[PDB]
Write a protein that binds this DNA or RNA. Structure first.
Ligand SMILES: [Zn+2]
Ligand SMILES: [Zn+2]
Ligand SMILES: [Zn+2]
Lengths: 481, 101, 635
DNA sequence: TTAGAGAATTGGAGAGTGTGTTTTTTTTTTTTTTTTT
DNA sequence: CACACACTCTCCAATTCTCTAA
């Protein structure tokens, strides 16, 4: 009688999928997860008795936010829904599309059946989404193979780079050249289902209907190139990498060089042999289509700020392994806070040099400061070219250790054996907090604004105490001053 | 744009241009079977001034010192040459999609 | 145009011989039929590839010749044209494969549903008051394994011996795998759904490229003259894992004045990721032309490019008791040291130091446990061979000359970027053997410092703002300016390493090519023997095998010995005197790095004797390596 | 007034004609200028 | 070269228009 809806190729009923997931998405107490893993001694009334996804959805409504995260193991925790976890892993694109809509049905039921006073169109207009995560065991990018096409997979990696955002068309917009009538045409599997004729029966002209690009509607696509994590590599060779497409609200989740864990459907597509024909290469380009990404009080101030010993406490706790050197600790501490700043000159940046034999822990202090400091960079005197420490122009800003650390400690070691062309970088930074450049049409100034912590050795043998500090570092007084 | 038909010597005018160059699909003379073979009249057709300027995210704004993201901005009419390289500018106008023509 | 010819082959005979072989054959001479039992594992889904041993088909033909019935020379067919027989053996298998006996959980698979709905639609249509390509349903990959010597598939070829006359034949090729693709899906059968008629159609692909169908041709679509639209479905397509590899001939094989040539190997199906770059390997495979397709096929002319389909792979190259079999011989420290590089005679304290790299100190929280050792002095002392011996002996070892850092590398080989991990990242949780340590760029030299100070390396290019964890023990060696070390002078005078780097090693060791009549006779008698007798001279002791040495060390490391009170009490009583004498001629003063060094060294000796903690009978030796190093700096 | 036979126009099958396609691009030498050697 | 796509040409029959007798 009812024309049953079935996921293609599966013998899975979409009504049973929906009417199970609804009855998980409410009535799931978090108690059930603490039965699944046990730890069942730990059960706490306040969290564990609450209807977990009810509280999540009431938050979504009031924040006006459209995305529900879902740890897939909850589906196994609840008796009715164990087989849905297996459907979610095996048939992601359809099972996620059922979950997306069930959220939207629930959001409406939670106000209209509950007869609560709120704006309905504010919910009806939203594209709600599930973002499933914790889906299964992670696997090596190198362990992927064609058995996995169209399944949820869980990967860990390092982001190499992102493309700038790509507009992906979601609704084409067409206009009749003869009659000015217009249509929203639905994009389907990336093909525009173009009309043959004007939709107005009073016009009905063939071929006169035409596309208007800036009246179409678009989604946001971004390619991330993701490298294999160095823990996973077979040690005989290089890491691999995989491209992944991140979509809609997940665009710019990641900076370059983030470690991330991703959940996505593993995809393959044919690619054209030649851009003028439909002839396709017999081995397919592969990527992951991601659905989730994961990375990698005042009274406590008063506990410290009232204290008698305070300055000595802070000094003895910024670097607690380091033996004595108490006045070095005491001054470095003031460099962390800094002085004061004004606009309408001088600024609250502070600069410190360490000098003495290479045989002592002073470099380890330079390490602790890099560990404690907001922002900041660690480098050394021989450690780059001058333009590699300041800035340069390329095939477009190259930026170095002396920049991108406003109010942050620029740690530098080996400062005595920095090359003099590279010493001659610092006067504009240390005296005016700023840099100037002009090349290839660019005329520009850059704000450097770093508190420098420098470290230096004696040239050659042990530092003699009779002879002066200017000589014994071989370093120019107007930079030392 | 404005065009003359080489087949019948008629004239077509006010021909709006999308991102691509666009000749008329049909001759305006009902004696003429033409759908192609058009020549531009350079006296009667009208040209805007135009300039592309390439801009990037400001070197103080980039959140972690990552790579600077760029944008292509199109200037027209009086607004051309109103900026210079290395300068800092505020532009207002539409965001557009440009087809790969 | 298309003439025809009388070849001495009949595939109807040979198909009958193959099916007669598969059902009949048992290797009962090893004292049911071998391939039937194998196919049961395939039907139960416990197995995904069928290996056909050509050496079996000899025993089949031998038994049939002994029964006086002349089997039709089948090995000489399938060596001579292997490609076509992959089709015949798949037909012969499918005709004979037994019904499953274990439950599959059938409805978890897509094709079980699709083909059943296709079955039922044909019955409900054909009531009316192949079915589809068989490659779609082959859940297994077929491979031939060649003849062992007991014939052309037996004799391994260098890459230049593979003439054009070999195309189509089963051959065996010997070489290094020089590079390897990431694994990608190739299609074999493409499934399409018609939108309007709701009917599935399959295209089979047998070329580098193909053209998609787009327009429906199902009976019920064309009979209803409905211009149905076909859409590709990857869920019902059949793919195979494809990986392309390149093989190069070995340096022994290249004739004098030529260049090492290469072949492309295509590995398909379960045999994938069996090859790794730098393997020396024999690959047996079916040699083939890769025909150009489309416009390139016209202009390329008759000049076919070529590749080898992999079929089988031969690599060229008790634990828990063997560590006791060492321990119960006794004196393990001195014998393990004497067993580092047994071909180098003398220099004992260096070997007795290097052993403590392999074993190392202990990390704490961070504080470094890794140990840094720098060998120093004259050329011709064979420091490079000793660093090389440590690279082979050590677990996770890496040799790397100055002749190193991680960096972004843009379009290496394929036109894509990579963040390349340098030798200091290859050496993660192991030994970095940096030979010619002073022949180094300042950009690498100052990146040694951050591996010391931070156990990491840092990147700052192309937006890659990353730090990579890089804990590693450094073994270093350097060579003097002016060709020989000057005993009038310091290491700091003979070598360009500054004290701010050179003083970061737990051991610096000056070893010299000192001339002396007896010592020179002892060396020259060893060298002049190795020119008469191609194997090493008599050691006059028995060394530990490197595998048993590795097996000891991996177990010795994890014991991470802890302090005993007399150690901390005693070590200060030495360290203070070492400071007091450093007060009283080079740079060799008692820095706190040397206290930490004595701790890590005493930990490495404690590990070697296998205990939770150890008495200062231990610590007194750690002080002796340091004391002997300083006396070696002076002489 | 319904309904059925004969005349005219339009749709699209399908036959025919014409065009473009491989494709790369680092490497190695030679030079001339800045500056960091 | 040859094999797909782009585009025009031509014929044939399918549908609707128009007139006549039942
Ligand atoms: Zn219209
Ligand atoms: Zn005209
Ligand atoms: Zn159809």
């Amino acid at each position: 009688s009812e024309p049953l809806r079935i996921i293609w190729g599966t013998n899975v009923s979409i009504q049973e999928c929906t009417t199970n997931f609804r009855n998980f998405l409410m009535s799931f107490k978090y108690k059930f997860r603490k039965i699944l893993d046990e730890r069942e001694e730990f059960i706490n009334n306040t969290t564990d008795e609450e209807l977990y996804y009810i509280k999540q959805l009431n938050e979504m409504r009031e924040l006006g936010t459209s995305n529900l995260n879902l740890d897939a193991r909850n589906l196994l925790a609840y008796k009715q829904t164990e087989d849905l976890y297996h459907q979610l892993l095996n048939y992601p694109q359809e099972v996620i599309s059922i979950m997306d809509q069930t959220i939207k049905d629930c959001m409406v039921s939670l106000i209209v059946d509950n007869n609560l006073d709120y704006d309905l169109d504010e919910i009806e207009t939203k594209f709600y989404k599930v973002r499933p995560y914790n889906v299964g065991s992670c696997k090596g990018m190198r362990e992927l193979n064609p058995n996995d096409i169209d399944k949820l997979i869980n990967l860990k990696g390092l982001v190499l780079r992102s493309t700038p955002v790509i507009p992906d068309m979601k609704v084409a917009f067409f206009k009749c050249n003869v009659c000015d009538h217009t249509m929203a045409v639905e994009i389907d599997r990336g093909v525009i289902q173009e009309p043959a004729r004007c939709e107005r029966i009073d016009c009905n002209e063939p071929n006169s209907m035409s596309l208007i690009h800036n009246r179409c509607s678009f989604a946001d696509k971004q390619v991330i190139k993701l490298q294999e994590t160095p823990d996973f590599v077979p040690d005989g060779q290089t890491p691999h990498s995989i491209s992944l497409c991140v979509y809609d609200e997940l665009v710019d989740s990641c900076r370059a060089g983030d470690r991330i864990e991703v959940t996505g459907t593993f995809r393959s597509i044919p690619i054209r042999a030649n851009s003028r024909q439909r002839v396709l290469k017999s081995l397919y380009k592969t990527y992951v289509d991601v659905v989730h990404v994961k990375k990698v009080d005042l009274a406590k101030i008063r506990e410290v700020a009232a204290r008698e010993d305070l300055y000595s406490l802070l000094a003895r706790s910024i670097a607690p392994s380091i033996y004595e050197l108490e006045d070095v600790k005491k001054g470095i501490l003031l460099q962390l806070f800094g002085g004061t700043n004004k606009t309408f000159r001088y600024r609250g940046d502070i600069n410190i040099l360490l000098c003495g034999d290479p045989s002592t822990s002073k470099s380890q202090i330079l390490q602790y400061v890099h560990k404690i400091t907001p922002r900041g960079v660690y480098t050394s005197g021989k450690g780059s070219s001058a333009v590699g420490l300041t800035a340069y122009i390329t095939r477009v800003l190259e930026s170095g250790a002396l920049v991108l650390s406003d109010g942050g400690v620029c740690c530098i070691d080996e400062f005595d054996k920095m090359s003099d062309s590279t010493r001659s970088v610092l006067h504009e930074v240390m005296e005016q907090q700023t840099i100037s450049i002009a090349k290839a049409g660019i005329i520009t100034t850059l704000n450097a604004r770093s508190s420098i912590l420098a470290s230096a050795n004696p040239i050659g043998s042990r530092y003699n105490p009779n002879l002066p500090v200017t000589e014994n570092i071989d370093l120019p007084p107007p930079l030392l001053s | 744009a404005s065009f003359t038909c080489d087949m019948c010597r008629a004239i077509v005018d006010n021909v709006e241009q999308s991102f691509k160059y666009t000749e008329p699909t049909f001759c305006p003379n009902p004696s003429c079977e033409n759908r192609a073979f058009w020549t531009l009249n350079v006296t009667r057709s009208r040209f805007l001034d135009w300039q592309k300027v390439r801009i990037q995210e400001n070197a103080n704004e980039i959140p972690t010192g990552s790579m600077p993201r760029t944008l292509d901005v199109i200037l027209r009419g009086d607004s051309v040459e109103r900026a210079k390289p290395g300068d800092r500018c505020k532009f207002t106008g539409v965001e557009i999609v440009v087809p790969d023509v | 145009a298309l003439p025809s010819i009388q070849l001495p082959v009949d595939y109807n005979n040979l198909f009958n011989e193959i099916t007669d072989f598969l059902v009949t054959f048992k290797q009962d001479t090893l004292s049911g039929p071998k391939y039937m039992a194998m196919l049961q594992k395939v039907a139960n889904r416990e197995l995904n590839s069928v290996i056909i041993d050509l050496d079996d088909i000899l025993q089949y033909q031998n038994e049939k010749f002994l029964q006086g019935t002349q089997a039709d020379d089948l090995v000489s067919a399938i060596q001579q044209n292997a490609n076509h027989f992959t089709e015949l053996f798949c037909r012969a298998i499918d005709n004979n494969m037994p019904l499953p006996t274990k439950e599959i959980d059938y409805k978890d698979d897509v094709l079980d549903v699709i083909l059943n709905q296709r079955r039922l639609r044909n019955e409900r249509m054909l009531s009316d008051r192949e079915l589809f390509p068989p490659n779609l349903t082959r859940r297994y990959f077929l491979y031939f394994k060649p003849l062992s010597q007991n014939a052309i598939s037996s004799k391994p070829l260098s890459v230049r011996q593979i003439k054009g006359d070999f195309l189509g034949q089963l051959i065996t090729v010997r070489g290094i795998i020089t590079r390897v693709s990431d694994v990608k899906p190739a299609v074999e059968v493409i499934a399409y759904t018609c939108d309007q008629c709701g009917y599935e159609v399959f295209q089979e692909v047998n070329s580098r490229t193909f053209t998609p169908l787009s327009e429906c041709t199902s009976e019920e679509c064309s009979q209803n003259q409905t211009k149905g639209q076909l859409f590709m479905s990857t869920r019902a397509s059949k793919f195979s894992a494809f990986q392309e590899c390149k093989i190069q001939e070995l340096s022994q094989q290249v004739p004098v004045g030529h260049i090492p040539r290469s072949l492309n190997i295509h590995v398909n199906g379960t045999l994938v990721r069996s090859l790794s770059p730098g393997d020396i390997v024999d690959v047996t495979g079916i040699f083939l032309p890769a025909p150009y397709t489309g416009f390139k096929a016209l202009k390329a002319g008759l000049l076919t490019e070529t590749y080898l389909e992999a079929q089988f792979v031969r690599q060229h190259k008790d634990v828990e008791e063997r560590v006791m079999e060492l321990i119960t011989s006794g004196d393990v420290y001195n014998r393990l040291a004497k067993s580092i590089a047994p071909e180098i005679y003398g220099n004992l304290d260096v070997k007795k130091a290097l052993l403590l790299l392999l074993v190392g100190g202990v990390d704490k929280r961070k504080i470094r446990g890794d140990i840094n050792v720098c060998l120093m002095g004259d050329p011709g002392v064979a420091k490079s061979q000793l660093l090389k011996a440590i690279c082979k002996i050590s677990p996770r070892g890496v040799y790397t000359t100055g002749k190193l850092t991680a960096a972004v590398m843009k379009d290496p080989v394929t036109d894509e970027m990579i963040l390349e991990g340098g030798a200091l990242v290859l050496a993660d949780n192991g030994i970095c053997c940096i030979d010619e340590f002073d022949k180094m760029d300042e950009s690498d030299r100052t990146a040694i410092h951050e591996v010391m100070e931070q156990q990491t390396i840092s990147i700052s290019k192309a937006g890659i703002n990353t730090t990579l964890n890089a804990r590693t023990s450094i073994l270093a060696a350097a060579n003097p300016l002016y060709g020989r070390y000057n005993p009038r002078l310091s290491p700091l005078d003979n070598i360009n390493l500054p004290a701010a780097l050179l003083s970061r090693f737990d051991i610096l060791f000056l070893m010299l090519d000192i001339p002396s009549r007896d010592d020179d006779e002892k060396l020259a008698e060893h060298v002049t023997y190795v020119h008469m007798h191609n194997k090493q001279p008599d050691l006059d002791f028995t060394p530990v095998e490197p595998s048993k040495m590795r097996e000891y060390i991996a177990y010795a490391k994890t014991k991470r010995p802890v302090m005993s009170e007399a150690v901390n009490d005693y070590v200060v009583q030495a360290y203070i005197r070492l400071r007091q004498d450093s007060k009283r001629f080079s740079f060799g003063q008692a820095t706190p790095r040397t206290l930490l060094g004595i701790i890590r060294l005493s930990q490495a000796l404690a590990k070697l004797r296998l205990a939770d903690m150890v008495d200062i009978d231990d610590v007194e030796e750690a002080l002796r390596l340091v004391r002997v190093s300083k006396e070696s700096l002076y002489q």
